[PDB]
Design a protein around this ligand. Structure first.
Ligand SMILES: Cc1[nH]c(C(=O)Nc2nc3c(OCCN4CCOCC4)cc(C(=O)O)cc3s2)c(Cl)c1Cl
Ligand SMILES: [Ca+2]
Ligand SMILES: [Cl-]
Length: 191
C-alpha cells in the first residue's frame, strides 16, 4: 500500500508534463488550480463557502477553505490517517519541494509536512479550534519547474475571478504578500 504510494511519487516526478500538461509557467499555475479545485468540490458538496489563496514570500502558496477538514481517521487500507493517504497521492505534493497541511476538525488542529510527497513525521495534534477547514501551504519544486517558480498575480486573479463567477456563493480571495510593503488583494463573491 505504502510501496504503491512511493512508486506513484516516482512516476509523477519522472514525467511531470504527463500529469499537469507542462513544466512551464502554465504547469506552475496548474498546481494552484489542483488545490483550489478540491476546496471548490467541498463547497459544491455544501460544506465550504470561503476559499483564500495567498502568494507568500518566496512564492509559497497557501490555500485555506472553511470545509469539514480533510479526515484524519485511520484507513484499514493504508493503516495511515486519511489526510496522509490523500496528500501522498497528490500531484501537487509530489511536485513540491515542501508542503504543509493544517486540518481543523474534531475541535483539533492536525499538522503534517512533506518533501516531494514524502511525509516528514506522523500527523500530529498541535492545537485546538472551534472552526473546521483545511490549510495547504506548498513550495513548487525548482527541480521540476526549471523555467519559473514565480506566480503571475494577474494569471491567478483572472482564474480565481472566473471560478467565483462559475461557482456562485463561494467567496474566493487572492492576496499577494510577496512584497510586505505593498500587499494586494482581490475578493470575488457572486450572488
Ligand atoms: C485545500 C483542500 N481542502 C480539501 C478538502 O477539504 N477536502 C475534503 N475531502 C473530504 C472527504 O473526502 C475524503 C477523500 N476524498 C473523497 C473523494 O473525493 C476527494 C476527497 C470527506 C470529508 C468527510 O467525510 O467529512 C471531508 C472532506 S474535506 C482538500 Cl483535499 C484540499 Cl487539498
Ligand atoms: Ca474532486
Ligand atoms: Cl476524522
Amino acid at each position: 500500500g505504502q510501496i504503491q504510494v512511493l512508486e506513484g511519487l516516482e512516476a509523477v516526478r519522472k514525467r511531470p508534463g504527463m500529469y499537469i500538461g507542462s513544466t512551464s509557467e502554465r504547469g506552475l499555475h496548474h498546481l494552484v488550480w489542483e488545490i483550489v479545485d478540491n476546496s471548490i468540490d467541498e463547497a459544491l458538496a455544501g460544506y465550504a463557502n470561503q476559499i483564500e489563496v495567498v502568494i507568500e514570500k518566496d512564492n509559497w502558496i497557501k490555500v485555506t477553505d472553511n470545509g469539514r477538514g480533510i479526515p484524519v481517521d485511520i484507513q484499514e487500507k493504508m493503516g495511515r490517517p486519511a489526510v496522509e493517504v490523500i496528500l501522498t497521492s497528490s500531484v501537487v505534493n509530489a511536485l513540491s519541494q515542501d508542503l504543509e497541511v493544517y486540518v481543523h476538525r474534531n475541535e483539533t488542529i492536525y499538522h503534517q509536512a512533506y518533501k516531494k510527497g514524502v511525509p516528514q513525521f506522523d500527523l500530529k495534534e498541535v492545537g485546538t479550534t472551534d472552526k473546521t477547514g483545511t490549510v495547504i501551504r506548498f513550495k513548487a519544486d525548482g527541480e521540476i519547474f526549471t523555467e519559473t517558480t514565480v506566480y503571475n498575480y494577474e494569471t491567478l486573479q483572472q482564474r480565481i475571478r472566473e471560478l467565483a463567477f462559475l461557482n456562485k456563493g463561494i467567496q474566493i480571495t487572492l492576496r499577494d504578500e510577496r512584497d510586505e510593503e505593498n500587499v494586494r488583494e482581490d475578493s470575488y463573491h457572486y450572488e
